[PDB]
Amino acid sequence: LIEGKTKQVFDVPDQPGLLLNKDRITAHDLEGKAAISNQTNAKVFEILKSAGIKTAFVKIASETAFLSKKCEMIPIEWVTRRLATGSFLKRNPGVPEGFRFTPPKQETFFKDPQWSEEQIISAKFNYNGLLIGRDEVDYMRKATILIFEILEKAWALRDCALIDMKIEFGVDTEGSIVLADVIDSDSWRLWPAADLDTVKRNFAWVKDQLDFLKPTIHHKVVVFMGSPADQEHCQKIAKAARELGLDVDLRVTSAHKATEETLRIMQQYEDTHGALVFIAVAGRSNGLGPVLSGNTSYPVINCPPPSDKLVQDIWSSLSVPSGLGCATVIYPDSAALMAAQIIGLQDYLVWGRLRSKQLDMAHSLRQADKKLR
C-alpha cells in the first residue's frame, strides 16, 4: 500500500506482481477528474512503451484505476526543463524566464530539497537488491531526459510547448529500473470552486488531445535487390527496419537486365502522398542504386551485400556521376537506421525508438563492463 492525496496503490494478491487508484482531488481542492488522470496517464505510458521505454505500467483496470508492475520507489523526483521558469527562477536569480536549456536541464529532488547526483550515490539507496550507484543514476538521468524529449515532441503536434516535467522511478522484482509513477497534468507544465471549473476545463482540454497524440503517418521503405540471391541480406534490413516501426517492401529487379521495368516499379511507388525511401542492394558492380538515384527524387541508399569483393566493388556505389545524391552504407542494420532516421523526421515514434535504442546500447556496455572489469 501507499497513500498519496491524489492516488492510492493497493497490492493485488491474486496477480503476482499492483493496482493504482486515482482520486478526484487537487493538491487542496476537488473536481471530477480521477477518470481524466487515469486516461491521461494510460495514454502517456503507452506512447513511451511504443517508444520502448521500460515502465511499471501494464493496463487499465477501470476508469479511475490501472494495473502496474509492483516495485519499490526511489525517493527522487526526476525533473527536466527546457526553459527557465517557475520555482527554478527563484533558486537561480539572474536567469530570465524563457532561458532555453540545450540539452534539457535535468535536476533531482528528495522527499522536498534538491540533491546532487553525488548526494544520491552517497545516500546508498537499496531496493530489490539493486544499490543505486552512478550507473543507475546515469541511466535515470538519460531516461528522464529522453522521456521529456519524446513527450515534448508529441505535444508539439497539438501546438503545445512542453516546458518541464517530473517523473519517478522504481526497482521491479528482477532488479530492473522501471518508470513507475503517474504522468498527468500535474506532472508537467504545458504552454501554447468557480476557478476549479476552468481547471476542470483544462484537464478536459488535455483529455481531448489524447487521441491525437499518436497519429498514423504513412511511409514505405522499398528494398530493391538486383538478384534473389541477395535474399537473406535484404531480410536482415527488413527485420531491423520493422523493429524500428517501419513498413517495408522487398522487391527484385535489375537495372541491367530489366532496365525499363525497374523504372516502372519505382514509378508505381512514386504514386503516393506518404514518405518513401529506397534501399538499393546490388552485389558486383552496383548500377541499381545509381540508376534509381538518376530517375527519382526520393532518397536512395546503397547497401551492398557482404562479400570478399566488397573492398573492390564499393566504388561502384560511391563515386556516382555528378548530380546524383545516392548515399552508401555497408551494413544492413545501418541501412535500416538511415531509413528510420529519415522517416523519423515525420514520425516521432520512430525517432523515439531510435533514441531509446541508443540508451539500450549504452546501458548494455556498462553491463558488459561490469563483467570484464
C-beta of residue 154 within 8 angstroms of C-beta of residue 166: no
Residue of 293, 282, 277 whose CA lies nearest to 253:
282
Site for a copy of itself in 296-335 (CB under 8 A): 297-301, 308-309, 311-331, 333-335
Q: Which residues contact 371 (CB under 8 A, 6 or more apart)?
A: none
In this chain, which of 264, 292, 305, 349 binds a copy of itself, going by CB under 8 A?
A: 264
Site for a copy of itself in 84-103 (CB under 8 A): 100, 102-103
C-beta of residue 83 within 8 angstroms of C-beta of residue 99: yes
C-beta of residue 180 within 8 angstroms of C-beta of residue 58: no
Nearer to a copy of itself, 32 or 306 (CB): 306
227 binds a copy of itself (CB under 8 A): yes
Q: Which residues contact 169 (CB under 8 A, 6 or more apart)?
A: 73, 74, 76, 78, 140, 143, 177, 178, 179, 180
273 binds a copy of itself (CB under 8 A): yes
In this chain, which of 199, 209, 268, 349 binds a copy of itself, going by CB under 8 A?
A: 268
Q: Which listed range, 70-78, 120-128, 133-141, 359-367, lies at the site for a copy of itself (CB under 8 A)?
A: 359-367
The CA-atom distances, in angstroms, between 189 and each of 13, 161, 162, 165, 235 are 36, 9, 6, 7, 44
Name the one residue in this structure whose C-alpha cell is 504513412.
Answer: 218
252 binds a copy of itself (CB under 8 A): yes
Nearer to a copy of itself, 50 or 334 (CB): 334
Q: Which residues contact 210 (CB under 8 A, 6 or more apart)?
A: 39, 40, 43
Name the one residue in this structure whose C-alpha cell is 558492380.
Answer: 285
Instruction: Supply the minimum distance, in Å, between the C-beta of residue 92 and a copy of itself.
Output: 19
276 binds a copy of itself (CB under 8 A): yes
Instruction: Supply the minimum distance, in Å, between the C-beta of residue 91 and a copy of itself.
Output: 22
Q: Which listed range, 84-92, 109-117, 180-188, 351-359, lies at the site for a copy of itself (CB under 8 A)?
A: 351-359
344 binds a copy of itself (CB under 8 A): yes
30 binds a copy of itself (CB under 8 A): no
116 binds a copy of itself (CB under 8 A): no
